[PDB]
Amino acid sequence: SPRFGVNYTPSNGWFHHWLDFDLDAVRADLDSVAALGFDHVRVFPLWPVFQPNRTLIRPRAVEQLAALTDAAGERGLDVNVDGLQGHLSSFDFLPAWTTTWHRRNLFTDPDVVSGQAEYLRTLAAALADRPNFLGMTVGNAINQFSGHPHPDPDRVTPEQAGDWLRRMLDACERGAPGRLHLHAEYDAAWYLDDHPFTPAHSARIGAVTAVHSWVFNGTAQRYGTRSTATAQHAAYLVELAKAWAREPRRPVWLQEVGAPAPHVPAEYAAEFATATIDAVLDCPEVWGVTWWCSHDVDRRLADFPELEYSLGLLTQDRRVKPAGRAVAEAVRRWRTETPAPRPRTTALVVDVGPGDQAPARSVCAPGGAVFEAFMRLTAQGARPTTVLAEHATDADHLAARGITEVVTPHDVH
């Protein structure tokens, strides 16, 4: 029931390939992905290339995306499209009509927002007749523009961020009705007290909860490369995200997971990949696992943080790397041969402060009491899920999720 895919980083040109779109290079990339057994790709337009002026959405760029989508479908790959990039791999791609003389908050300016909505509706409507089109993700961790540590953020309130998300997803739904439209925020949404994108936003707006699991976020540094916390980090984000859902079986999509050097050294990447995926597949209701990323980044492109270059499952010339070989069996076995995991009946209480804005959510970050209690329960074999403090004695909430035992971080010690 969990699907298996990759975040597609075009080997020739990286995301700048939209400026030199080569369908045969894309076909060869997708062939090398399909050969490892994946069933979907997550793909990335570059927003200022597609919408260089607020009222110019380039039809040729839309046609190229459709051709990419059709090429993926010929190779047995479904396609999720991320709209607003926005941020990719340390670089911000911002249209000139949003910056300096035209600086206008990405989340609140009425004209920017209507321009974003028309962009997203246009992409979704163009792919709506593709059977392998899964739906849209609003944008790749667009929440990284909304506050620190961004050097120049478009600060917003949680109320403002939620309003914006609902408008963006309405546009996706109007473009492609009935498809799988979601938003996907990086882990500040679960770990930073002040951050305006909240756990509630992730679990209650959009079709599924998307989480992006990256052990350079303090996890590998604090607990160690070969620790239980590092191996279980993706499973933790999946079970943590469930605490805020209103539907007891709302799917959680592990939409990014990668093996970043030096926190996961190259010679440990395959072992880490297998352990991380084994752990997350012991979590019920996982929509899918989508590895970051398909192909190493061309070192002929300068100024990436070193870690970005070697995140591929395939080399830049499409050779299978050790983690690619590894995943291409923690997929064949995970598919077909791995039973859906049993329910997790022990829930750890998550006290994130009252209201829906999670002002104390850093207890969930690496080093926090909720994080460490979850990892302790995990090491003990308890297979924990999570429950909000507000629901810790809510018998209807617990029964709907099959939770029979509730423990606080203090109980765990």
Ligand X SMILES: CC(=O)N[C@@H]1[C@@H](O)[C@H](O[C@@H]2O[C@H](CO)[C@@H](O)[C@H](O)[C@@H]2O)[C@@H](CO)O[C@H]1O
Q: Which helix (H) or strand (E) holds 355?
A: none
Question: Residue 29 binds which one of a copy of itself, ligand X, none, with CB within 5 to 8 A depending on kind?
Answer: none
The site partner of 387 among ligand X, a copy of itself, none (C-beta below 5 to 8 Å per kind) is none
Is residue 140 at the binding interface for ligand X, with CB under 6 A as the rule?
Answer: yes
Nearest distance in Å: CB 282, a copy of itself: 36
Residues 231 to 260: which contact ligand X by CB under 6 A?
256, 258
Question: In the bound complex, what is the minimum distance in angstroms from residue 69's beta carbon to ligand X?
Answer: 20
Instruction: Give the integer Cα–Cα distance in Å for 364 and 158.
Output: 19
Binding partner of residue 292 among ligand X, a copy of itself, none, CB under 5 to 8 Å per kind?
ligand X
88 forms part of the interface with ligand X (CB under 6 A): yes
Q: Is 296 in the site for ligand X (CB under 6 A)?
A: no
Taking CB under 6 A as the binding criterion, the range among 83-91, 191-199, 330-338, 369-377 that sits at the site for ligand X is 83-91
Minimum CB–partner distance for residue 362 and a copy of itself (Å): 23
Instruction: Provide the b/e sequence for 185-215 (b: ≥16 CB within 10 Å).
Output: bbbbbbbbeebbbbbbbbbbbbbbbbbbbbb
- Both tokens of 15, joined, read 């995301």
Residues composing the chain: 413
Binding segment for ligand X among 26-34, 53-61, 64-72, 86-94 (CB under 6 A)?
86-94
H/E stretch holding 13 reads: none
State yes or no: residue 303 binds ligand X (CB under 6 A).
no
Please report how close the Cβ of residue 110 comes to a copy of itself at its closest, in angstroms.
12
Which positions touch a copy of itself (CB under 8 A)? 13-14, 16, 19-20, 49, 52-56, 58, 60-61, 90-94, 96-97, 99-103, 111, 115, 150-152, 300-303
Contacts of residue 407, defined as CB under 8 A and 6 or more positions apart, other chains included, come to: 346, 347, 348, 349, 373, 377, 384
- Name which of 12 and 69 has its Cβ closer to a copy of itself: 12
137: left (phi over 0), alpha (psi -120 to 50) or beta: beta
Choose the one of a copy of itself, ligand X, none that binds residue 212, judging by a C-beta under 5 to 8 angstroms depending on kind.
Answer: ligand X
302 or 395: CB nearest ligand X: 302
d(CA 73, CA 80): 12
Residue 120 neighbours by CB distance under 10 Å: 28
Residue with smaller CB distance to ligand X, 258 or 409:
258
**Tokens matching residue 267:** 């010679």
Query: Which span (19-27, 85-93, 122-130, 222-230) binds ligand X, by CB under 6 A?
Result: 85-93
Q: Which of 29, 185, 187, 239 binds ligand X (CB under 6 A)?
A: 187
Contact between 154 and 145 under an 8 Å Cβ cutoff? The reply is yes
Q: Which stretch binds ligand X (CB under 6 A): 10-18, 47-55, 82-90, 331-339?
A: 82-90
Considering only residues 258 to 277 of the shown chain, the ones binding ligand X according to CB under 6 A are 258
Cα dihedral 46, 317, 289, 379 in deg (nearest 10): -120
Nearest residue (CB) to ligand X, 309 versus 390: 309
Q: Using the rule CB under 6 A, is 186 a contact of ligand X?
A: yes
Nearer to a copy of itself, 96 or 266 (CB): 96
Distance in Å from the first CA to the final CA of the chain: 36
Beta strands in 351-409 (DSSP E): 385-388, 405-407
Report d(CA 275, CA 258) in Å as an integer: 12
Cα–Cα distance measured from residue 87 to residue 281, given in angstroms and rounded to the nearest whole number: 29
Element (H, E) at 292: strand 286-292
Residue 223 in contact with ligand X, rule: CB under 6 A: no
For residue 214, state whether it binds ligand X (rule: CB under 6 A). Answer: yes
d(CA 32, CA 390): 47
Q: Which residue in the set 212, 233, 344, 401 belongs to the binding site for ligand X (CB under 6 A)? A: 212
The contact set with ligand X (CB under 6 A) reads 87-90, 101, 140-141, 186-187, 212, 214, 256, 258, 292, 305, 308
